[PDB]
Write a protein that binds this ligand. Structure first.
Ligand SMILES: CCCCCCCCCCCCCCCCCC(=O)OC[C@H](COP(=O)([O-])OCC(O)COP(=O)([O-])OC[C@@H](COC(=O)CCCCCCCCCCCCCCCCC)OC(=O)CCCCCCCCCCCCCCCCC)OC(=O)CCCCCCCCCCCCCCCCC
Ligand SMILES: CCCCC/C=C/C/C=C/C/C=C\C/C=C\CCCC(=O)O[C@H](COC(=O)CCCCCCCCCCCCCCCCC)COP(=O)(O)O[C@@H]1[C@H](O)[C@H](O)[C@@H](O)[C@H](O)[C@H]1O
Ligand SMILES: CCCCCCCCCCCCCCCCCC(=O)OC[C@H](COP(=O)(O)OCCN)OC(=O)CCCCCCCCCCCCCCCCC
Ligand SMILES: CCCCCCCCCCCCCCCCCC(=O)OC[C@H](COP(=O)(O)OCCN)OC(=O)CCCCCCCCCCCCCCCCC
Ligand SMILES: CCCCCCCCCCCCCCCCCC(=O)OC[C@H](COP(=O)(O)OCCN)OC(=O)CCCCCCCCCCCCCCCCC
Ligand SMILES: CCCCCCCCCCCCCCCCCC(=O)OC[C@H](COP(=O)(O)OCCN)OC(=O)CCCCCCCCCCCCCCCCC
Ligand SMILES: CCCCCCCCCCCC(=O)OC[C@H](COP(=O)(O)OCC[N+](C)(C)C)OC(=O)CCCCCCCCCCC
Ligand SMILES: CCCCCCCCCCCC(=O)OC[C@H](COP(=O)(O)OCC[N+](C)(C)C)OC(=O)CCCCCCCCCCC
Ligand SMILES: CCCCCCCCCCCC(=O)OC[C@H](COP(=O)(O)OCC[N+](C)(C)C)OC(=O)CCCCCCCCCCC
Ligand code: SF4
Ligand code: SF4
Ligand code: SF4
Lengths: 309, 24, 61, 140, 56, 123, 68, 190, 340, 117, 60
């Protein structure tokens, strides 16, 4: 006879919306039935009532710690349909900010994970780095979280004048900030007690279940869309892909921790190779014209009017 | 050999292009 | 053209550190074990000396 | 005492919960003011509704509100909780948490910056500071 | 299962409502083959009363 | 693997009406049996006979549906509902949706002929 | 800088009355040059003490007790 | 050469097979050293020391509301309606802001002013629907609606968050100087 | 009678306020280890924070759930607090300087400690919230298991002294602190005092992430105050046990030379100065221990139930029985059985 | 009436006084929804042997440890005689501890894939 | 090996000076690790609202 407990919704590990109905025979989980939809909003129904430009912010708020990668997936879909090309500088900016976004997301995931197991301090240390990067978000887009910066055709605005230096200055010390978290976590035997051989997933079942990302690379399969289907400027930059072998919580932790380093490498490369030119596609039938044209030129004013109406 | 004399990046010579060439 | 755009320095930035930097520190484990044995031995020496003298004080009392 | 020991129940639902965590991050340190987020509603004064409230979640929210001992306050954080926000015309979204629980302070934003949330906290404390407790009894 | 295809990963399954067709919904399957670095899409159709065979 | 949950029945469209009516009557019996469990779970004010009356009305509503596929769909949805109720997935709020009549009188004026409907602009 | 010496030096630089005012409003002890004044009456200060971290080099002293 | 159901890229990389795990007897460290680390918790003391080192570093906190975090010209806070230096409103009821707003926050009505100008007679923003996206500000062809850097306007009831024309103009009048700062800083990038 | 009253009020006030300020000290220390500030706003430098929390909780409504035994739910925190505070009656701040100078002081400490599992054992039955029940059973198991380790270290120390008077145990340590010959025993007492107190990393009993809150999920107002107070008072008290068993209690250094320089005869000045020296030594040892509790809380992730039970019953307890064998053997070898 | 007994009496009085202050000052408004038990916000038993076994084996081991109190209080008087006796006692108990360890008392798909061609 | 350790004086972070520097180097787990605090005269200065490049920017 199974004993049924409602894990979540009001539970810090549950993240507030995970009603996880478990059935226990003593200590051991026999069946698990996650219930979702406490955060079903009808994003997909609402997008059909929105222009593409208007529908872009729906994606910021899907994975609300990886905003710019969401904007990037939607932008790539719409540009592929539109048969247009993002300028080089725009591609490089989208790569830099995709990796700043990856760093932010991994800080949130790793530190929230360690807080769930009980390690409360990396939460705060990594949250200061999160603050530093959200300064860069706010400087390029005007919002800390929901930037709406990456748009079909490129990015909404060019970088402010003093941003590359500040990113580089932060990059000179992020390495140490990582080493300190690793000092607390990588070799701690309690951490390895909580993570080694927990949640083991085989390669074949990983493929069968539809898992991707670290959840798949932890099981030994070297698959990475950035290397396999080179999108944006992921072919102009040099980085490695970490692959686990045991497919347990510890391998995935190691993978994430090394993806931190690879992201730092990519950010530095884009800081060194940022080219000049436009940031959005230069056809005013897709992206709006600069305001100095919109206020002097008839064609530009018409295109601006139509694009925003 | 210390942070009080770390070199000011902000005054380094930046790269400058005159015209950007992006083929159609 | 491109005037006033944020651009990297002509020579580029100095390379940042990104590989793992967790240098090993500490004496060898056997040195720590030897120190522990020394401290424990000296402590036992003093403790047993004190116990014996306390016994002689008990004799006097 | 009520302002100095400001204990919320965390009830975090979506993207607003991230700015709610950044309030506790080192840079703003809600703890320096006396704010401890406590998981049980039994040990909490304040509920912060930080996120889109769905129709599936409305009974649970009202249940957690009911299980807070008095005196209790509620702060509505974010556009989604204020007025249904960017999903105001969805078929499964409550158009504002004040349909479900009484609310004392509305913090606008999507998401409200951490400074805006702290300002909303200061407003709630200002409301506490002007509350008559024994003076009200004397008026009876 | 074929050696030349090997589409081991299911990516997503969805429906698209076409009210003009006699069969409203068209069910879409996306597959991914990590072996070959290739993707494929498979479509079927269904109605509000005729079911589709589950691939679970 | 991901295993089914309590009271889960795999989806099967009956090829013949009679084999469907067998399942339909089984489902009705399950609902009648579960009525007291529903009354305990959802803290209802009303009585078990009223639960059973409501169930009978629900099953009655589709008593003359002919086309087999529609019957299959209705049966599948009825079973999904039963599984929803019996596993306490549902809350009291959604459960009482089924029971609009046992709430009190909503007001003095529920119009029935054309003049009262017309006075309220509902004619 | 969290050091006690910083607090003692700022308190000496600022004077006892201003130290008590700061301890009763801000809770820290800050010493910086006055920059300007609002229409509302608050006063704004900037500091160049090297022991002050980024984002703490400007601050305000509200005019009223019920500051906002 | 010729592949059958495979390719050079699908062939395993050089060294994909992992080396066999080592047994206990093929270990470099003596049992006594391993036991020293085991019983004296070496890495736990290293972790404790790294934690203790932070205790003597400068903290990151700032003392809000006496200090403030960084704010940029592009920041998106509360809304305000601007005027021309002559004091005539800038909004000409073109309603592009109404058309682009992804949350349908904006409600506008218009008609010929008594002096013949095209102006608004009602301009509302529901600040509880707004997602603070700044499209309304990119859209307006006369810079009339803008988003101030102000975030401190929390209210005690919802009816104060339904801005009408009078409130939004008052905000513009009140924040014009800061709006000019942000405009002078960012206008070349729009 | 009057003197007795004044002594008890002085001691009680010092203990209660030390517990109150330990909470603030914990928040501040964790804060600075996390690069933040912690309470610095309620009272000057956040010195009134604990009293703010107190007053608030005393003004909070008491909720008695429907299926609960309200008497048990209200009295269980009360008894755990009483025993936690009664434990202080035997702690000396100087030779003979204590409220209770019992020849069975050690036995009193152990007994009142063994009365400490009843709050955990009873609250789960009283709350009836399921989370509380799981937490309560697991806690009762963990606490008794580690109480075994603590009692065993007590016995090992008494092997050196042959007395159950706490002051005598402290006095025997003028020759050397017992944490020098028995450093490994001191490590185990810390690891076990952490576990017996239910602190991180061994916070499985009331861990928010595995179980929301813990056994206290249902405790609001003064009952929550009691559990809180009992927990921090027990932290300080078990640091006290550590202090006088292993760190030499109120012994710091031989100040005979200094006193002979300063004074020329006995006086209330010299008695007060000696009292301050002894009490300062004992309080600095207490402070280092409390800091270490906070430090360990900052540094490590939690254990699982299986992990800590395995620890206590397979790694610690065998070592302690081995020491049971090896301490009297060393006494016998060197003819140093201690006299009464 | 020494300090000991007065302190012992005083502590429960302080506890009761704090409780009475709470009862006197706090509001008290129970209602059905508030009285519900809290389980993550919404309304809603076999155990393992090691749970039983930790508790049950606590009692013998506690008795073993507390049986050494007379020894450590009389070590000198019993000399090298009692010494040997208590070694034998300890070893006999250590045997039971070994039994417990080796039986693993407190502790709580690898087939190959073969095709018939 | 590129990406290896770089010394602490090439990192834009405050750090220590005087006798405290020597104390830090003696007592640090890894002496080349920075403290995380950005250098106030260098970092995010001039402020974004007072960049000189704003008055020269032209659409690219
Ligand atoms: C038996 C074999 C003996 C052979 C022998 O002669 O060894 C020589 C041995 C050095 O040989 P080694 O093992 O190769 O170590 C050289 C490394 O450079 C090790 O030096 P290091 O620079 O890597 O680190 C030294 C530092 C390790 O810790 C640190 O790295 C910094 C810690 C700062 C401590 C702040 C307080 O030492 C400690 O602090 C350990 C004490 C831990 C608690 C304090 O010197 C000693 O014997 C010193 C004995 C001190 C024992 C203290 C432990 C208690
Ligand atoms: C240290 C504390 C300092 C703060 C001191 C007083 C502030 C807190 C006072 C406070 O909130 O109780 C207010 C009354 O308000 C006054 O006007 C009642 C008069 C206030 C009594 C003041 C006593 C001050 C020193 C107390 C020691 C709320 O009780 P209330 O009206 O629901 O009246 C009662 C009361 O709460 C319960 O004892 C009853 O059991 C219950 O039936 C309930 O109805
Ligand atoms: C009573 C319940 C449990 C009693 C626990 C026994 C604690 C104890 O050891 O009491 C010893 C102590 C006197 O013992 P002793 O050490 O010899 O004092 C010499 C001081 N120079 O005793 C004392 O100092 C004071 C006695 C305290 C207990 C008195 C309670 C009276 C019990 C009758 C209750 C009536 C109903
Ligand atoms: C975790 C916290 C660990 C901290 C332990 C502190 C150890 C240092 C104090 C040792 C105290 C002791 O038991 O003996 C000290 C004693 C002082 O001598 P004195 O003041 O002249 O009194 C004369 C009568 N013997 O006699 C002595 O001076 C003997 C020398 C001191 C004992 C050995 C010191 C070296 C080992 C220190 C390591 C401690 C753990 C690391
Ligand atoms: C070489 C000859 C030695 C002769 C004997 C030595 C005499 C006694 C030595 C004194 C210390 C003994 C007590 C600690 C022993 C540690 C044993 C251990 O590591 O426990 C391991 C346990 C899991 O067990 P296991 O399966 O064996 O681990 C392999 C996993 N694949 O998993 C665990 O339990 C993890 C370890 C628990 C650590 C608890 C930490 C909580 C408190 C931290 C204490 C640190 C000190 C804090 C003080 C502040 C610093 C000043
Ligand atoms: C030390 C401080 C001592 C303070 C204790 C005073 C208690 C006063 C509270 C009271 O009047 O009764 C409370 C008690 C609550 O229980 P009840 O209301 O019956 O059921 C609740 C189920 N949700 O109601 C009861 O059932 C009463 C049980 C206790 C009997 C004492 C009678 C008090 C009468 C007041 C005069
Ligand atoms: C309040 C005052 C601050 C005290 C905080 C504790 C500081 C710990 C310093 C790091 C030591 C370390 O980690 O040493 C690590 C060593 C392991 O060395 P290895 O990896 O094999 O190096 C080998 C490579 N070599 C040799 C070539 C460099 O551990 C051990 O063998 C046993 C553990 C000893 C640590 C016990 C600490 C005692 C402190 C008690 C108080
Ligand atoms: C299994 C343990 C074997 C250890 C063998 C070591 C022998 C070394 C020779 C030094 C003895 C000596 O010379 O010092 C003698 C000391 C001090 O006595 P004393 O007052 O100075 O003698 C004067 C004679 N009167 C009193 C009759 C006048 O006596 C001791 O008890 C100290 C012994 C050293 C400590 C050994 C403990 C080992 C760790 C035990 C952990 C379980
Ligand atoms: C040992 C005790 C040390 C603490 C005493 C200093 C705190 C203080 O006196 O602080 C001033 C307090 C109110 O503190 P505040 O309102 O938070 O102002 C603090 C300013 N800011 C900017 C930090 C907000 O004034 C009082 O009414 C003092 C009466 C309290 C007496 C009870 C003391 C119990 C012991
Ligand atoms: S108001 Fe905006 S930021 Fe907050 S939860 Fe809703 S969508 Fe996310
Ligand atoms: S910020 Fe966005 S939602 Fe708000 S008014 Fe402007 S366009 Fe509409
Ligand atoms: S877009 Fe600008 S000018 Fe047009 S109606 Fe809106 S505010 Fe007025």
């Amino acid at each position: 006879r199974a004993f049924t407990i409602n894990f979540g919704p009001q539970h810090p590990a549950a993240h507030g919306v995970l009603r996880l109905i478990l059935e226990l025979s003593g200590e051991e989980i026999i069946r698990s039935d996650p219930h979702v939809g406490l955060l079903h909003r009808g994003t997909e129904k609402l997008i059909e009532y929105k222009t593409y430009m208007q529908a872009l912010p729906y994606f910021d708020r899907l994975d609300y710690v990886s905003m710019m990668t969401n904007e990037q997936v939607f932008s790539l879909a719409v540009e592929k349909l539109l048969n247009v090309e993002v300028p080089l500088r725009g591609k490089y900016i989208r790569t830099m900010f995709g990796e700043i976004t990856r760093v932010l997301n991994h800080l949130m995931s790793v530190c929230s994970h360690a807080m769930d197991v009980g390690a409360l301090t990396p939460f705060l240390w990594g949250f200061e780095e999160r603050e530093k990067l959200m300064e860069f978000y706010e400087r390029v887009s005007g919002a800390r979280l929901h930037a709406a910066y990456v748009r079909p055709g490129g990015v909404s605005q060019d970088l402010p004048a003093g941003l590359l230096d500040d990113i580089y200055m932060w990059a000179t010390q992020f390495g140490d900030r990582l080493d300190e978290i690793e000092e607390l976590l990588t070799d701690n035997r309690i951490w390895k007690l909580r993570t080694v051989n927990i949640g083991t997933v085989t390669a074949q079942d990983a493929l069968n279940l539809g898992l991707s990302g670290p959840m798949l690379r932890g099981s030994g399969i070297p698959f990475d869309i950035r290397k396999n289907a080179p999108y944006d400027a992921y072919d102009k930059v040099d980085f490695d892909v970490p692959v686990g072998m045991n497919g347990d919580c510890y391998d995935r932790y190691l993978i994430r921790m090394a993806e931190f380093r690879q992201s730092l490498r990519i950010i530095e490369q884009c800081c060194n190779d940022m080219p000049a030119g436009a940031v959005k596609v230069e056809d005013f039938k897709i992206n709006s014209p600069p305001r100095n044209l919109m206020k002097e030129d008839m064609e530009a004013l018409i295109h601006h009017f139509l694009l925003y109406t | 050999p210390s942070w009080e004399n770390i070199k000011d990046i902000r005054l380094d010579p930046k790269v400058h292009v005159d015209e950007v060439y992006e083929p159609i | 053209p491109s005037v006033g755009q944020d651009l990297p320095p002509v020579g580029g930035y100095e390379p940042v550190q990104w590989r793992r930097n967790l240098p090993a520190r500490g004496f060898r484990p056997l040195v720590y074990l030897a120190a522990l044995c020394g401290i424990c031995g000296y402590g036992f020496y003093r403790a047993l000396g004190g116990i014996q003298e306390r016994r002689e004080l008990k004799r006097e009392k | 005492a009520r302002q100095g020991s400001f204990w919320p129940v965390t009830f975090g639902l979506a993207c607003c919960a991230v700015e709610m965590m950044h309030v506790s991050a080192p840079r703003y340190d809600q703890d320096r003011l006396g704010i401890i987020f406590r998981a049980s509603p039994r040990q909490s004064d304040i509920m912060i509704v930080a996120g889109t409230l769905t129709n599936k979640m409305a009974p649970v929210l009202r249940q957690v509100y009911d299980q807070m001992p008095e005196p209790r306050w509620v702060i509505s954080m974010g556009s989604c909780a204020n007025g249904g926000g960017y999903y105001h015309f969805s078929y499964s979204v409550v158009r504002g948490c004040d349909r479900i629980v009484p609310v004392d302070v509305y913090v606008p934003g999507c998401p409200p910056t951490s400074e805006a949330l702290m300002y909303g906290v200061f407003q709630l404390q200002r409301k506490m500071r002007n509350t008559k407790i024994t003076r009200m009894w004397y008026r009876k | 299962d074929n050696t030349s295809t090997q589409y081991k990963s299911i990516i997503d399954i969805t429906a698209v409502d076409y009210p003009s067709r006699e069969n409203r919904f068209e069910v879409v399957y996306n597959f991914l083959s990590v072996r070959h670095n290739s993707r494929i899409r498979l479509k079927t159709y269904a109605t509000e009363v005729t079911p589709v065979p589950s691939i679970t | 693997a991901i295993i089914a949950t309590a009271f889960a029945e795999t989806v099967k469209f009956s090829g013949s009406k009679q084999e469907l009516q067998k399942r339909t009557l089984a489902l009705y019996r399950q609902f009648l049996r579960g009525a007291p469990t529903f009354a305990d779970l959802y803290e209802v004010q009303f009585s078990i006979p009223t639960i059973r009356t409501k169930i009978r009305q629900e099953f009655e509503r589709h008593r003359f549906v002919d086309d087999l596929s529609i019957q299959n769909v209705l049966y599948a949805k009825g079973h999904m509902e039963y599984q929803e109720c019996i596993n306490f997935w549902k809350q009291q709020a959604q459960f009482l949706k089924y029971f609009p009549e046992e709430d009190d009188i909503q007001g003095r004026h529920q119009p029935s002929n054309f003049v009262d409907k017309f006075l309220k602009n509902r004619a | 800088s969290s050091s006690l010496y910083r607090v003692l030096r700022n308190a000496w630089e600022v004077g006892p009355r201003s130290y008590w005012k700061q301890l009763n409003s801000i809770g820290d002890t800050k010493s910086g040059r006055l920059v300007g004044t609002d229409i509302y009456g608050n006063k704004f200060y900037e500091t160049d003490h090297q022991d002050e971290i980024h984002l703490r080099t400007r601050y305000v002293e509200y005019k009223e007790k019920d500051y906002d | 050469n010729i592949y059958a159901g495979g390719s050079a890229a699908a062939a395993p990389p050089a060294g994909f097979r992992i080396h066999r795990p080592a047994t206990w007897e093929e270990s470099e460290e003596g049992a006594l050293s391993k036991a020293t680390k085991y019983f004296l918790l070496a890495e736990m003391f290293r972790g404790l020391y790294v934690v203790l080192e932070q205790f003597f570093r400068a903290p990151y906190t700032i003392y809000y509301p006496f200090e403030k975090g960084p704010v940029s010209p592009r920041f998106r806070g509360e809304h305000a309606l601007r005027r021309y230096p002559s004091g005539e409103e800038r909004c000409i009821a073109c309603k592009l802001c109404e058309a682009i707003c992804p949350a349908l926050a904006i409600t506008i009505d218009a008609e010929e002013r008594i002096d013949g100008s095209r102006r608004t007679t009602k301009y509302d923003i529901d600040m509880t629907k707004c997602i603070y996206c700044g499209y309304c500000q990119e859209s307006c062809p006369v810079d009339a609606i803008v988003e101030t850097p102000n975030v401190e306007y929390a209210t005690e009831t919802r009816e104060e968050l339904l801005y009408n024309k009078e409130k939004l103009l008052a905000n513009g009048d009140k924040w014009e100087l800061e709006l000019q700062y942000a405009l002078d800083a960012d206008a070349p990038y729009r | 009678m009057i003197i007795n009253i004044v002594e008890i009020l002085i001691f009680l006030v010092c203990v209660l306020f030390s517990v109150a300020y330990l909470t603030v000290a914990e928040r501040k220390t964790l804060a600075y280890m996390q690069r933040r500030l912690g309470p610095n706003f309620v009272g000057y430098y956040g010195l009134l924070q604990a009293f703010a929390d107190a007053v608030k909780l005393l003004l909070k409504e008491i909720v008695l759930p429907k299926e609960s035994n309200y008497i048990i739910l209200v009295i269980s925190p009360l008894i755990t607090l009483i025993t936690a505070l009664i434990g202080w009656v035997v702690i000396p701040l100087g030779p003979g300087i204590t409220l209770g100078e019992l020849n069975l002081g050690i036995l009193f400490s152990l007994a009142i400690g063994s009365l400490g599992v009843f709050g955990s054992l009873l609250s789960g039955w009283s709350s009836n919230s399921k989370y509380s029940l799981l937490g309560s059973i697991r806690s009762t198991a963990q606490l008794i298991s580690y109480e075994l380790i603590l009692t065993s270290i007590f016995i090992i120390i008494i092997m050196f002294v042959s007395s159950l008077n706490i002051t005598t145990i402290i006095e025997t340590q003028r020759v050397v602190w017992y944490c020098i010959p028995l450093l490994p025993l001191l490590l185990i007492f810390f690891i076990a005092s952490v576990a017996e107190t239910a602190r991180p990393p061994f916070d499985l009993t009331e861990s928010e992430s595995e179980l929301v809150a813990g056994y206290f999920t249902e405790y609001s107002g003064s009952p929550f105050v009691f559990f809180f107070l009992a927990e921090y008072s027990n932290i300080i008290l078990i640091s006290a046990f550590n202090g006088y068993l292993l760190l030499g209690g109120y012994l710091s250094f031989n100040y005979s030379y200094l006193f002979n320089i300063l004074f020329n005869d006995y006086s209330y000045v010299s008695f007060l100065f000696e009292g301050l020296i002894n009490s300062s030594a004992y309080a600095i040892k207490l402070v280092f221990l409390m800091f270490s509790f906070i430090w360990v809380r900052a540094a490590f992730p939690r254990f699982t139930y299986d992990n800590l039970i395995n620890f206590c019953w397979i790694i610690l307890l065998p070592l302690l029985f081995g020491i049971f064998l090896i301490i009297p053997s060393t006494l016998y070898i060197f003819d140093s059985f201690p006299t009464l | 009436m020494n300090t000991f007994i007065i302190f012992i009496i005083l502590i429960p009085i302080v506890g009761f006084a704090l409780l009475a202050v709470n009862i006197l000052l706090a509001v008290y408004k129970p209602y059905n929804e508030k009285l519900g038990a809290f389980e993550c916000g919404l309304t809603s038993l076999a155990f393992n042997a090691a749970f039983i076994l930790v508790a049950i084996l606590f009692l013998p081991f506690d008795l073993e440890i507390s049986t050494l109190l007379p020894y450590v209080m009389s070590i000198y008087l019993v000399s090298n005689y009692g010494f040997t006796i208590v070694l034998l006692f300890l070893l006999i108990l250590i045997i039971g501890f070994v039994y417990e360890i080796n039986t693993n008392a407190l502790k709580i798909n690898t087939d190959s894939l073969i095709y018939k061609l | 090996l590129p990406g290896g350790p770089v010394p602490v004086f090439k990192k834009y972070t405050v750090g220590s000076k005087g006798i405290w520097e020597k104390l830090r180097v003696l007592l640090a787990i890894a002496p080349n690790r920075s403290t995380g605090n950005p250098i106030v005269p260098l970092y995010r200065v001039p402020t974004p609202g007072s960049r000189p490049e704003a008055n020269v920017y032209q659409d690219p």
